[PDB]
Design a protein around this ligand. Sequence first.
Ligand SMILES: C/C=C/[C@@H]1C=C[C@@H]2C[C@H](C)CC[C@H]2[C@]1(C)C(=O)C1=C(O)[C@@H](CO)N(C)C1=O
Length: 366
Amino acid sequence: MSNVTVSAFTVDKSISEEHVLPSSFIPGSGNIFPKFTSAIPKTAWELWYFDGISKDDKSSIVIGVTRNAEGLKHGGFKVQVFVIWADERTWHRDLFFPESVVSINESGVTDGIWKDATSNSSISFSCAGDLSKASLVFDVPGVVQGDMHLEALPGDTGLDTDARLGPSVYYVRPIGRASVKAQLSLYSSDATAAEQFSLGTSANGGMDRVWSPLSWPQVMTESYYLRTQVGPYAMQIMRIFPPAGSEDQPSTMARLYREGQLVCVAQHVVTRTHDSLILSKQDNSDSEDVVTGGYRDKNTGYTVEFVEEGQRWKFQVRHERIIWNTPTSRPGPDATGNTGFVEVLCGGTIGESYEGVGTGGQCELS
Ligand SMILES: C/C=C/[C@@H]1C=C[C@@H]2C[C@H](C)CC[C@H]2[C@]1(C)C(=O)C1=C(O)[C@@H](CO)N(C)C1=O
């Protein structure tokens, strides 16, 4: 091909002779192209993440497209698909492909394709060169078939901000705020039947972009993720507590937008100089429509305070529905695990009561 830059990872085939060079964080960029190209630390990983959640019916789709070093040796490159219907039924596969190819083409479009030529099966994504739009095609016969579309909402892109998440992780938000659609056919375990999934109306989400040379165990013991449009407000929170045996503070990459204007850029999480975030969890059973992780963390929700005589933004986060529960420990009375949530939100400034839904995920390593 001509004027097309490519990084091809094939299972059981060396990357040592890839022409393209590795990079770190590129300020002001989406950073969509892979960082580990011709050499990959044995613990390193890369993530292209997309989601959408409908406010009208709370259907939700969560996509995780990964590379890691281990994958090049053994087992391939994992793609995680999680869906929840309005009625709270859930569908989710971990799918592994032997080949992972990312492309920047002559137009400046970036394409990724995780594929298996043997099964004639693939999941791909495409990002416009101006990050106005991204889309995904699912084509795994008798598992998942369909697509997903994201349109960036007017306003600040937030790409001119720091993407460090503590000292060893990068977390860019290539599409911070987005309207999202999705039409999927999701097959049973035996591949004999299928159900239609249509993401509900008034759905927001986005695209995140994350890598580290270290495995997350060496990075975090706990993590919480939130993404939400709440009236004129949009926010993204990624908060981690540093690994066991560390004097480091909790790191955050938190952003608050108002009518598309970026109004708060927290890279510091505090309690009670720099834009900062308070993120404190609750256990009260105020209302009936509440739920919790199926592991040791029994929190029902969070309070989210953004602090700029600066203006003040507070939001209650109620866990209403479970998208997923996946373990990170043997079962027990003190088991840890990962939980995906349909989040319900309410707040803003003093006096304000805007309502939204959001995706959230909390992870604890044992
Ligand atoms: C499969 C790996 C994913 C990612 C890997 C390691 C990261 C460590 C980093 C320091 C914090 C967050 C972790 C990531 C960003 C993550 O948040 C999760 C997801 O991707 C979705 C599903 O895709 N999910 C299940 C998680 O909530």
